[PDB]
Every structure is written in structure tokens, then in C-alpha cells.
Amino acid sequence: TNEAFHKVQDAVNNNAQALSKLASELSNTFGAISASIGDIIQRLDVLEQDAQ
Amino acid sequence: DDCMQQGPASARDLICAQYVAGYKVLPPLMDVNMEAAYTSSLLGSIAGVGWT
Amino acid sequence: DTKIASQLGNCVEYSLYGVSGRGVFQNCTAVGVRQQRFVYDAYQNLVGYYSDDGNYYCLRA
Amino acid sequence: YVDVGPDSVKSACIEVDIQQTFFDKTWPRPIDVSKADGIIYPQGRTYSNITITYQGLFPYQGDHGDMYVYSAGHATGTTPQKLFVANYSQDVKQFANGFVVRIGAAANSTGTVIISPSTSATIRKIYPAFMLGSSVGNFSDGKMGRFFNHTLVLLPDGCGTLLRAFYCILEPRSGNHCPAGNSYTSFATYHTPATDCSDGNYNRNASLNSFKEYFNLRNCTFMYTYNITEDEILEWFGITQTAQGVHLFSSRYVDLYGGNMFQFATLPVYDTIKYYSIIPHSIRSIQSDRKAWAAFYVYKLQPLTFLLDFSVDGYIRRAIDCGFNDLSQLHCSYESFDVESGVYSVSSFEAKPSGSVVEQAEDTKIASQLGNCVEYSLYGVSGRGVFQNCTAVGVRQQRFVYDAYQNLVGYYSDDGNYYCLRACVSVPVSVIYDKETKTHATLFGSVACEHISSTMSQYSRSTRSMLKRRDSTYGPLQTPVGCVLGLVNSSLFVEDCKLPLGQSLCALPDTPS
Amino acid sequence: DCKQYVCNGFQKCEQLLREYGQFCSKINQALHGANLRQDDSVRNLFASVKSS
């Protein structure tokens, strides 16, 4: 309930989200069939894998 | 060691995830003991700011 | 052809019921849901698996 | 084909007395997703210790369910007589993506034995029977609910101790009271507990054999039996169809004392199920052995987005039906409710469209309709909106005037009039939410209270019931910030409500008891 | 109100928009934060203006 305290907590939260976002993007597809190279290779023929 | 199989199975640190992400968290510049030395120097500077 | 049921461990390639990847398995306690075999994390990565030997392994990649 | 045993040799069927008024009871047993009722565990993987948002096949919050009542047949008090059923066989519903059922909802309660309304008995769980298929039509005597070719029948038997799932051509028998004979009403299945529910020896074929009195089983492609542990435990069960077959789901084998439904079996039915109905059922008990049965409830599944709360044991113990109300849409987007304030903008009220206006030289009156929000087509120009009689702006004789954003401003009609187009108007909404008292009030902003009522037909969300609890007794109160329901005029001055409305206004939370 | 902003009441749009729902969640929450900062700034400034 202390505004200065809350700001301290946000400095921490702001750094936490900067990494959480880089980390969660590793599982995000980008119009791709999969965010996983291993799964792209395993279930797709080579001519399609490069596009994914 | 705590992100390795030779450690507690319960570790879920976002730091452990860095070994896969290719991300690294860097250490702080001062350490707690030097920061404490700098503010203990301020405490010893109290009494006082008068006498010009 | 043997023994490839499990190998604990360091960094082993794997294929489990169509699920693929590479990593180290650790003998650990179960987290749920039971009987659904493959447990995933907040980032949709595999956390661990219930094997046909009755054991649950944690995956640390 | 599959040998499913011999045909019945009975020359006639049991007469079925269909008396729907006796089954016309009210006892809704709705799905409450906050406890994850009706939630089918997501397939292909598991999670634990997490709240996620997921789009998939789920029942919706507040669905009361279609109530299916099974009952004792007629009896002399010494022997059973005719069957006594609800008109369920003709109640053909769309299968679509599947449905779920709540089984034994009234189990262990005491209530009517149905056939004799003044008589009550302890209520028992009974498993539902279904008839499903890709095509339906009429019977040769004009009755409805005929399924064609191979029909999927889900027929519990053995007094609820086995499920018979089968797919056969049902060949109607011609004897008295049979589907192709004299005085047919509806086929119904039955069992006779006096001989069929003997302890240690249930007649595992009692309902199959009664079914067989009405239809012969032909060219069966399958018949599978599943065993059922007999208990009175509230149970989730359900069905879906995919490209891989028909999926039978239950909480019975994985979460018996919980309710998350899991798949337990798949049937090889590749003919898309389009239609289904409940098989009526009657128990040939005697008056001294007349029991009460729990109704089962059928709720539909549809592709819905839910927040699903997975405990450490991986079971869903809570869910949020994101579109149920305005606050719930916010909870899904914001994860929870005490997150910050709960004071956020919410989804707006759409408009509610009216019949169209059409004009084009190249059924009445559609020349114009002034007005509110009407669909239109004018010389190839389409849209929806309200027309206003107004002065002309140019250029004359070019018919359609557009604005700075290339939107239609107005049109010169063939009646000589020029109308201004305002498209449709809508009602913006915001919610004032208190995470401490778990209460709220709402604003319509600029709409003003002359257009506000406690009920709405616009609409912005499926239900407004959380506000109605208090707002149903108040008119809207008009303020400089906007029109608000649930405001209460107190004439107070406070420094900070933690719900300021801006300007010089504040929404003050009440005090906890 | 992203659902309305992106498309003016069309179901086909909403069906495709749904695939992107997480985007608009970020938009509204980011603006929520900015509007709160605006209010805190205004009240904190006037608080210094007022005399006892």
C-alpha cells in the first residue's frame, strides 16, 4: 500500500518480464507450423522445412 | 549443479532455462559488501553538515 | 538395440510415444495429471514423462 | 459381420405408454465452471501448477442441461405391466462436435417415482441410453426418429453395470407394438429388476434383449462392452466425433471423485454423426419395488475459450467461461480479479440491427426506415446504419457523399430526399470493480441515462446478472462522468475511493460487515 | 475495444482475430498502465499546489 515500495517491486517485475518475454518467444510460432525445429524436420519433407 | 540431473529434481529456475535459451544473466557490479561500505561511509558523515 | 529404455544420464536423444527431443532424465516425483503421460511447462516444453516401467522422469533437456 | 447373438423370438413387443406430463418436472443441474464442472481434460498432453487460456470443446457456464427422466413402468402391484416413458426417442438433436452428460445428479436424494407423483423413493443413478447416426427420418407408420443404415446405439445394460456400444443396421420387427407393426408408439428399452438385478447375477443382456424385441441387429460392424463399477457417485460422461472415430469420455476411470472427464474408449464410426436422441427407458418393477431415478442432464459442447486452473496434481479445479460476462472477459485477459483494480474498460454493446433498406434501379416497406440501425444496399453500396433526414451537401447528382476517412456521409435517394448516415450507434461500457468486497457498478459513459435500463437488448455480454442482484431495484443515476447503474446517491465527499471516476467524482466501496 | 477496432462487427474477422487475441490484451494492459501514470502525475502535482 506504500507507493515507493510498489515502485521497488515494479523495478524487479520489469526486469523479470524483459526475460520472460524473450523466453516465451522461444515457443512462439511466427506464422510457422511449429516453434520447434526438431518437429519441423521430423514431420515435413525438406522442400517445406526450409520455409517453416 | 542445481540445473543438472546431479541436483534436486524440483529446480525450475528461469536461470536453469538459460542453458537452453542461450541467454545469460550477468552479475551485479558492486556486491552487497561494497554497497554497504559506501553507505556506511555516508552514515559516518552524519553530524554534521553545519560549520560551513 | 539395448539398453535404450532409459539412460540416466547426461544428454540423450529420445523418442517417446511420438514425442521427440534430446536431454537428461532424472528420477523424480510425479506431478500430474496422472495417466496422461507427458507433462509440459509454462512455455509448453516437456517437464517430464510417465514411462511404462512405472517411473516418472523429469526432463532437464 | 459381427455376431451379436440371435434375434428375439417374441411374436410381439411390449406396449410403451408415453406420458410426458409425468416427466414434466423442473430440476436444473447446471454446469458451474468455477469448480470446472463439465470440463473435459485437454488431450495429447498434461500440465500442472498453472492457469492457462485455451480454446476447445467445452460446455458453457450456466447450462442447466436437458433433463432426462427414466421411470418405473406400470404394475398391478404383484406383477409389472406396460412400459412408462417420456417422449425421448423422437427428441433428435444435432450432434455437431459432441455433447456431455451429467449422470446421477439427484442420486441419494429422495423424490418422486414419476409414474405415481404422490410416491417418493430414494433416487438411484441410472446410465443413459442413446441412439446416434448420420441420417434420420420417419417410420412407416409416421413416427419420427428413425435412424438409417448403421445406427450407433449406446445401451447400458445389467442394471447399469455394463455399457453396450454397437453399430448395426436396425431392422424393425413387425409384431404387435413393434416399429413395423400394429399400435406402435415408441420403442423403449427396459429391464425387469425382479429377475434382472439379482445380486451376484445381473441380467447383463436385459436391455439388449428388450431392444432386440423392436429391432433385429444386422450387419453389425461392432459391439463393444465396457464394465461399470456400480456406485451413486456424481459422474461426468460425454461424446465427440473426430476424423479418427467417436470418442467416449468419462470421469469414471480417471477422476471418479472429482469430475474431470477423460477419454476412455474410441468407437470405429467414421460416418459423421449428425443426429442423436435419448432412448426412453422404463423399469419393469412392481409397486412395492418402485424406485426413483436420477435424471441425467445433457449439455452441448462447443469451441469455447476458457481459463483452466491446473492444480499440482494436474486436474482442472476451476475454469472461467471468458465470454460469460464483462468482468469474466477481463479476468481471462488479466488472469485474475484482484489483479490491480478490476476497474477496466469492458466489451461494448453492439447496436442490435433492424430490417434493411434497399434501393437500386436496374418486400415492403424497405425504401427507407428511419430509424435506429438498419442494414442497407443502395445502388451497389452496402452497409448498416441509421438514416436521418437532413440537408444536402454536395455534389448534387452524384448520389453518395463520403467523409475524410472515405466513409459514407449520406445519400441522395430516388424519393428526392437526402439522408445523412450515422452508421449505427453503440453503448461503450466500463466496470468499477472492488476486489475487496467482490462487487461492482457500471458506466455507459456518453450514452446517458435516457437510453439506459437495467436490462439490455443490444448486447455486450451473455449475462448482466452480477449487477442485477442489486441494480434490479434502482433506476440509473446520471453523473457528469457518465450514466451508472448501482451508484446510490449518498452526497459524500471523499479524498480517494481507489475507484475515482475522474473529474470531481468518486465511486466509494461499501464497508465489510 | 480491439474487437470493434479491428473489425466493425464481422464474425469472419472475429474468427481470425481470435488467433491474435494476445496482442490486444497487451495493447489494453499497456494503455491501462499509461493512463494510471497520467492520473498519478496529475494528483501528485496538484497535491504540491495546495496550501494548508
Ligand SMILES: *[C@@H]1O[C@H](CO)[C@@H](O[C@@H]2O[C@H](CO)[C@@H](O[C@@H]3O[C@H](CO[C@H]4O[C@H](CO)[C@@H](O)[C@H](O)[C@@H]4O)[C@@H](O)[C@H](O[C@H]4O[C@H](CO)[C@@H](O)[C@H](O)[C@@H]4O)[C@@H]3O)[C@H](O)[C@H]2NC(C)=O)[C@H](O)[C@H]1NC(C)=O
Ligand atoms: C449377451 O449379448 C451378447 C452380445 O454380444 C452375447 O455375446 C455374443 O454371444 C454369442 C453366443 O451367444 C457369440 O457368438 C458365438 O461366438 C463363437 C465364438 O466367438 C468368436 O469367434 C466368432 C467367429 O465368428 C467371432 O464372430 C466372435 O466375435 C468371437 O471372436 C462362435 O463359435 C459361435 O458360432 C456358433 O454359433 C453361430 C450362430 O450364433 C453359428 O453360425 C456357428 O456355425 C456356430 O454354431 C457364435 O458365433 C457372439 O460372438 C458374442 N458377441 C459379441 C459381440 O461378443 C452374450 O453371449 C449374451 N449373453 C447372454 C447371457 O445371453
Ligand SMILES: *[C@@H]1O[C@H](CO)[C@@H](O[C@@H]2O[C@H](CO)[C@@H](O[C@@H]3O[C@H](CO)[C@@H](O)[C@H](O)[C@@H]3O)[C@H](O)[C@H]2NC(C)=O)[C@H](O)[C@H]1NC(C)=O
Ligand atoms: C451418493 O452417496 C455416495 C455414498 O456416500 C457418495 O459417494 C462417495 O463420495 C465421496 C466424495 O467423493 C467419496 O469420498 C472419496 O474417497 C476417496 C478415497 O480415496 C478419496 O480419495 C476422495 O478424495 C474422496 O474423499 C466416497 O468414497 C464415495 N463413496 C464411495 C462408496 O465411493 C456419492 O458421491 C453421492 N452422490 C451424489 C450424487 O451426491
Ligand SMILES: *[C@@H]1O[C@H](CO)[C@@H](O[C@@H]2O[C@H](CO)[C@@H](O)[C@H](O)[C@H]2NC(C)=O)[C@H](O)[C@H]1NC(C)=O
Ligand atoms: C440407408 O437406408 C435407407 C432406407 O432404409 C436406404 O434408402 C432406400 O433405398 C431404396 C433403394 O431402392 C429405396 O427404394 C428406398 O425408398 C430408400 N429409402 C429411403 C428412406 O431413402 C439407403 O439406401 C441406405 N443406405 C445405405 C448406405 O445402405
Ligand SMILES: *[C@@H]1O[C@H](CO)[C@@H](O[C@@H]2O[C@H](CO)[C@@H](O)[C@H](O)[C@H]2NC(C)=O)[C@H](O)[C@H]1NC(C)=O
Ligand atoms: C446386410 O448386407 C446384405 C448384403 O451383404 C444386404 O442384402 C442386400 O440388401 C439389399 C437392400 O436393397 C438388396 O437389394 C440386395 O439384393 C441384398 N443382397 C442379397 C444378397 O440378398 C442386407 O439387406 C443387409 N442387411 C440389412 C438389414 O440391411
Ligand SMILES: *[C@@H]1O[C@H](CO)[C@@H](O)[C@H](O)[C@H]1NC(C)=O
Ligand atoms: C526414484 O525412483 C524410486 C522408485 O521406487 C521412487 O520411489 C523415488 O521416489 C524416485 N525418486 C524421487 C525423487 O522421486
Ligand SMILES: *[C@@H]1O[C@H](CO)[C@@H](O)[C@H](O)[C@H]1NC(C)=O
Ligand atoms: C414425418 O411425418 C410428418 C407427418 O406430418 C411430416 O410432417 C414430417 O415432415 C415427416 N418427417 C420426415 C423426416 O419425413
Ligand SMILES: *[C@@H]1O[C@H](CO)[C@@H](O)[C@H](O)[C@H]1NC(C)=O
Ligand atoms: C465385466 O466383468 C465380468 C466379471 O466376470 C467379466 O466376465 C466381463 O468380461 C467384464 N467385461 C468387461 C467389458 O470388462
Ligand SMILES: *[C@@H]1O[C@H](CO)[C@@H](O)[C@H](O)[C@H]1NC(C)=O
Ligand atoms: C508449484 O509451484 C510451487 C512454487 O513454489 C512449487 O514449490 C511446487 O513444488 C510446484 N508444484 C508442482 C507440481 O510443480
Ligand SMILES: *[C@@H]1O[C@H](CO)[C@@H](O)[C@H](O)[C@H]1NC(C)=O
Ligand atoms: C426533412 O425532409 C424535408 C422534405 O421536404 C426537407 O425539406 C427538410 O429540409 C428535411 N430536413 C432537413 C434537416 O433538411
Ligand SMILES: *[C@@H]1O[C@H](CO)[C@@H](O)[C@H](O)[C@H]1NC(C)=O
Ligand atoms: C444526488 O442528490 C443531490 C441532492 O441535491 C442531487 O443534487 C444530485 O444531483 C443527485 N445525484 C444523482 C446522481 O442522483
